[PDB]
Write an enzyme that holds these catalytic residues in place. Sequence first.
Site, mmCIF file in Angstrom:
data_model
loop_
_atom_site.group_PDB
_atom_site.id
_atom_site.type_symbol
_atom_site.label_atom_id
_atom_site.label_comp_id
_atom_site.label_asym_id
_atom_site.label_seq_id
_atom_site.Cartn_x
_atom_site.Cartn_y
_atom_site.Cartn_z
ATOM 1 N N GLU A 73 0.791 -1.227 0.000
ATOM 2 C CA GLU A 73 0.000 0.000 0.000
ATOM 3 C C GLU A 73 0.838 1.301 0.000
ATOM 4 O O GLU A 73 0.314 2.402 0.244
ATOM 5 C CB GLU A 73 -0.955 -0.044 1.196
ATOM 6 C CG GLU A 73 -1.709 -1.391 1.341
ATOM 7 C CD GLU A 73 -2.982 -1.300 2.188
ATOM 8 O OE1 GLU A 73 -4.000 -0.816 1.672
ATOM 9 O OE2 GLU A 73 -2.967 -1.713 3.364
ATOM 10 N N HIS A 92 -1.297 3.968 8.530
ATOM 11 C CA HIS A 92 -2.489 3.433 7.891
ATOM 12 C C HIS A 92 -2.849 2.120 8.593
ATOM 13 O O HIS A 92 -1.964 1.368 9.006
ATOM 14 C CB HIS A 92 -2.242 3.173 6.398
ATOM 15 C CG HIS A 92 -3.297 2.323 5.756
ATOM 16 N ND1 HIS A 92 -4.607 2.708 5.579
ATOM 17 C CD2 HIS A 92 -3.215 1.069 5.251
ATOM 18 C CE1 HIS A 92 -5.263 1.712 4.985
ATOM 19 N NE2 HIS A 92 -4.462 0.686 4.763
ATOM 20 N N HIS A 94 -6.400 -0.887 9.412
ATOM 21 C CA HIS A 94 -7.726 -1.382 9.108
ATOM 22 C C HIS A 94 -8.493 -1.546 10.451
ATOM 23 O O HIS A 94 -9.133 -2.565 10.681
ATOM 24 C CB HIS A 94 -7.620 -2.724 8.350
ATOM 25 C CG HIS A 94 -6.914 -2.627 7.019
ATOM 26 N ND1 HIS A 94 -6.751 -3.692 6.158
ATOM 27 C CD2 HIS A 94 -6.299 -1.584 6.416
ATOM 28 C CE1 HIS A 94 -6.039 -3.268 5.085
ATOM 29 N NE2 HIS A 94 -5.735 -1.987 5.186
ATOM 30 N N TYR A 113 -16.143 17.185 20.579
ATOM 31 C CA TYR A 113 -15.285 18.320 20.245
ATOM 32 C C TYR A 113 -13.881 17.961 19.779
ATOM 33 O O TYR A 113 -13.261 18.741 19.072
ATOM 34 C CB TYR A 113 -15.268 19.377 21.372
ATOM 35 C CG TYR A 113 -14.409 19.015 22.535
ATOM 36 C CD1 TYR A 113 -13.064 19.345 22.541
ATOM 37 C CD2 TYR A 113 -14.924 18.282 23.609
ATOM 38 C CE1 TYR A 113 -12.232 18.954 23.570
ATOM 39 C CE2 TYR A 113 -14.087 17.871 24.661
ATOM 40 C CZ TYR A 113 -12.733 18.216 24.626
ATOM 41 O OH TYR A 113 -11.872 17.809 25.630
ATOM 42 N N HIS A 155 -12.525 -0.245 3.404
ATOM 43 C CA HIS A 155 -11.075 -0.434 3.571
ATOM 44 C C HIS A 155 -10.479 -0.108 4.945
ATOM 45 O O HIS A 155 -9.977 -1.002 5.603
ATOM 46 C CB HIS A 155 -10.341 0.355 2.453
ATOM 47 C CG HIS A 155 -8.875 0.075 2.351
ATOM 48 N ND1 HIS A 155 -8.178 0.048 1.164
ATOM 49 C CD2 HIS A 155 -7.958 -0.191 3.318
ATOM 50 C CE1 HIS A 155 -6.888 -0.234 1.443
ATOM 51 N NE2 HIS A 155 -6.696 -0.391 2.746
ATOM 52 N N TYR A 209 -3.940 27.416 22.184
ATOM 53 C CA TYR A 209 -3.224 26.576 23.143
ATOM 54 C C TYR A 209 -2.211 25.508 22.695
ATOM 55 O O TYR A 209 -1.131 25.391 23.285
ATOM 56 C CB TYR A 209 -4.243 25.936 24.091
ATOM 57 C CG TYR A 209 -4.940 26.925 24.996
ATOM 58 C CD1 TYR A 209 -5.911 27.796 24.500
ATOM 59 C CD2 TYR A 209 -4.641 26.971 26.359
ATOM 60 C CE1 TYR A 209 -6.574 28.687 25.338
ATOM 61 C CE2 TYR A 209 -5.296 27.857 27.206
ATOM 62 C CZ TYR A 209 -6.263 28.709 26.692
ATOM 63 O OH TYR A 209 -6.933 29.558 27.540
HETATM 64 CO CO LIG Z 1 -12.157 16.574 28.887
HETATM 65 CO CO LIG Z 2 -5.061 -1.003 3.670
#
Ligand SMILES: [Co+2]
Ligand SMILES: [Co+2]
Lengths: 210, 210, 210, 210
Positions: A73, A92, A94, A113, A155, A209
């Site tokens: 890949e 990367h 899966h 958040y 994928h 921050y």
């Molecule tokens: Co917190």
């Molecule tokens: Co893959």
Amino acid sequence: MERNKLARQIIDTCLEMTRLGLNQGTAGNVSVRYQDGMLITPTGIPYEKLTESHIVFIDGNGKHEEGKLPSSEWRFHMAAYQSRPDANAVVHNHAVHCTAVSILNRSIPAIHYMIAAAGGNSIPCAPYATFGTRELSEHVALALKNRKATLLQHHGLIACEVNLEKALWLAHEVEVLAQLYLTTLAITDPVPVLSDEEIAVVLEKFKTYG
Amino acid sequence: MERNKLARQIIDTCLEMTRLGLNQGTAGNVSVRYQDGMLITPTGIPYEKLTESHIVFIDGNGKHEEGKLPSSEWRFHMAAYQSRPDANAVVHNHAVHCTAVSILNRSIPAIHYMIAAAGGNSIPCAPYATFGTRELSEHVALALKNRKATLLQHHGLIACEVNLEKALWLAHEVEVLAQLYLTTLAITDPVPVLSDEEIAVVLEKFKTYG
Amino acid sequence: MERNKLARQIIDTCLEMTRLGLNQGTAGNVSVRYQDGMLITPTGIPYEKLTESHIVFIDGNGKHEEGKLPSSEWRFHMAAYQSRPDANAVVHNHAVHCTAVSILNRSIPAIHYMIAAAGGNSIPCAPYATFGTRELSEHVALALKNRKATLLQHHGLIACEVNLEKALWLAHEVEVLAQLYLTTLAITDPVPVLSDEEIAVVLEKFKTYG
Amino acid sequence: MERNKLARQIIDTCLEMTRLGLNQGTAGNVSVRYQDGMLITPTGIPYEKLTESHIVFIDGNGKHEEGKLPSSEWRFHMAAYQSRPDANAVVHNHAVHCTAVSILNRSIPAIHYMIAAAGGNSIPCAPYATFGTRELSEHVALALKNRKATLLQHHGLIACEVNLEKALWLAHEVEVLAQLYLTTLAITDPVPVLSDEEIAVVLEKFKTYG
Ligand SMILES: [Co+2]
Ligand SMILES: [Co+2]
Ligand SMILES: [Co+2]
Ligand SMILES: [Co+2]
């Protein structure tokens, strides 16, 4: 920034990725930006058999070290680097939760958040294309233009950052977000989300921050 | 009750919190009441790199030790201490199950008798406000008035107790309750619950025994 | 069959129970049949602080060793022993999956052939009663008359066997069955089951082989 | 290819299978092709008590080593070897996710491209028959004719490969696919899939690369 020291980190990331539960079906691959190309994990070697000498260098032309086979890949690791100049490491995998959301081909909306860590109010899902192809590479490059992580339909996941530690951390965070979304979706559809303005404030705050 | 001994405990809690699976996305923060303020974990340091010298002291005025950056979420640790005088330690995290329930903005009702460990017949969910703000602090102080733990909408969990060991234990227990509620909710809505009288007896019984 | 050797096993079971993920909210308790009563874990001591000297003996009259407090849930350990004479060890816990099914107050039907390990074509759910009460004890004794394990409504699980190793093994197996049932139930209701005749053959077969 | 060296590998697979979470209810069994029959794990011995001397040899006639009891499920290990000549190792387990899908008696369709690792565009589910019977053996032999792994209705999974390492790897991969399918199914039915042509390209590609 010696190759052998970069090679170890890559290996420690594979081990740690496994420890966190992101490396199931041992399908992940990790790389870092190096010289005019990158250092990446090889194909055909289970992580625990890895030594620094197994790490493969691929130049900017797509040509790799003689006698070494890079991850199957690798192509999208190169697409990520060329799409996001600021990216220095790519992870990367899966991971199960990210993959299930990618099977539904839905992006992850702002249910928490921390979604701002990837750069915006969502984690996109790039359309499916056969692994190792240039068409898959295109979809990836386009999704990473404004985000540091993307799901890949049917994928898995690609996350990039300024170093291996942050890239690993981001990947882990998207997996948590992924599990949070599947869990709530099974109860209610659609899942309540935070507004775009509210995500705008958190982004500004993270800029402030760190 | 020497600072360095309190500093170690804080660190052992972070490690143990991680071991239990409450520390995902490494977002937790832990503090204890000390002198006229508190000792809390710093911002920007992954738990395994923590040494006793990284622990930050914040006085009662909101002023911290020079040269040290406290957790970005310290403000509600101070709100918890001022709301519940009996609280000596605070544990905050973004545990997955607690967070999913908080995304649905539902309180956890009495589906199990151990819910009495938090002080009543429920685990509340305080409304959402940007992290680190005084408005978030208000919502927290108000939810902890009659409970030792609260979910925080689109965010996570805050649990307080008389020492770190019990605070950690409570947090872990709310996470289990959280997973129990999501699991049953996916099958049936609403989830059967124990009556208020039945919770009244368990509370009295816990007062009796310990 | 020396007390100190029985005390160690009890402790190893607590540790191992934790290792398997059955000991969440550290609420389990384990006992063995000894002399005219039983040896059981004490109340108020987290498993890792346990030493052989903490193990408490309770005679057949319900009177315990001086200076030692037995588990707050000892009463049903005594009910199990008096209901099933062949039972030599009892393991109780608040495992998550078993508990969620018990919150729905449903018995686990024959969705897998291993359900025969508990003695029949199901794992029952005994009605709810306040912990530590004689009424809870009655419901337990009645459910164990023809089964070696039972769910306890809005509470958890009790499994008994001829030794600690098998009791632990059974408890673990009911937890798996519990997770299998919740998983399929979220997809389809009711869950397909094996017939009573088919369970009759497996039971006979287990009698034959072991 | 000395017996004692094959015996160790078998044991390491049991340990590793457990480590991965496939060995719940300690019900798995593993074998390798040896001489004119196979070497398999014994019945009645928990994996951690296993020594090379416990491994049992069963010839091609179904006759085993004197004084040793082979797994109660050996018969289908022999059916697998006779159905797929290229198979050199067999791994069987009762992994939770695979089992839940098998309880719904559904095959796993092409929700992910890695499904091609088992040989086609699906993981089949063989109909139920009492364990240890010749009828169960038939259903297994028939499902493995064109696939390397199959679910077994109300039972679990059988995966075969050219060596223990790959067989273990396949089994682990089917478990992931199994969890991915259950997760999405709870949200949407049917689950989107990749077309037969698309699976045709991945298969060809795996033939090319390895
Ligand atoms: Co917190
Ligand atoms: Co893959
Ligand atoms: Co209990
Ligand atoms: Co089996």
